[PDB]
């Protein structure tokens, strides 16, 4: 569960280069009494990392995208969510600009992705 840092190397570059770096940096990045306390604290780090990863996979489990690094769902865009030519999306923007831009539509998209499993 130490691959959370390797996500961040593609910040600043645009969305297509980051989408390639997803697959590339995912494939490449894979008895004294005072010592048992160190063993227990390192296990409490590792098991916490495993539980945070499983919670992040369970939140992708609602939407039918558990385990998939990239999935393509069945919820059509109402085009009042970034009414923009998607060449400009995948070439002129970074991910921080998306988290800023569609921030007021993201709970709506999450509700639709939950409701489109029924």
């Amino acid at each position: 569960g130490a691959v959370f840092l390797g996500f961040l190397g593609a910040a600043g570059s645009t969305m297509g280069a980051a989408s390639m770096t997803l697959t590339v940096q995912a494939r490449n990045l894979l008895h004294l009494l005072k010592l048992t306390v160190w063993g227990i604290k390192q296990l409490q780090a590792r098991v916490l990392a495993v539980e945070r990863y499983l919670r992040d996979q369970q939140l992708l489990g609602i939407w039918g995208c558990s385990g998939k690094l990239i999935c393509c769902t069945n919820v059509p865009w109402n085009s009042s969510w970034s009414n923009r030519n998607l060449s400009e999306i995948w070439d002129n923007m970074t991910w921080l600009q998306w988290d800023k831009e569609i921030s007021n539509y993201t709970q709506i998209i999450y509700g639709l992705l939950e409701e489109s499993q029924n």
Partner: nanobody
Amino acid sequence: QIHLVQSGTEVKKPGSSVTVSCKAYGVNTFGLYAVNWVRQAPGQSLEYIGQIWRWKSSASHHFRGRVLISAVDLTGSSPPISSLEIKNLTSDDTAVYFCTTTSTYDKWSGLHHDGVMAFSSWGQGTLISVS
């Protein structure tokens, strides 16, 4: 507690230059904040001029080559000063000028969109007449 203060009312000649000061009391630095100079012709609506966000001076396409926007940080005995110089004045620049400052510290704020900003804190008005 920004208490941004400008200079006083001025009048010049056509075909000349002018300079308007903007002292930024209560501003940490211009690395964190960003200064947007804007103007208003008498009776009209507010017309953008330029900015110096992240120490990159830039003016709009209407005003290129005629306008210089400079800044000195909070050093020593003086607060951060922005300044607006206009070369080759015409009689159609008689207007109330404003320097504005907004905070660019938080990326997920909403007051700014990649260097295009809402004007969260304002000056008080520098009228320039041209005769």
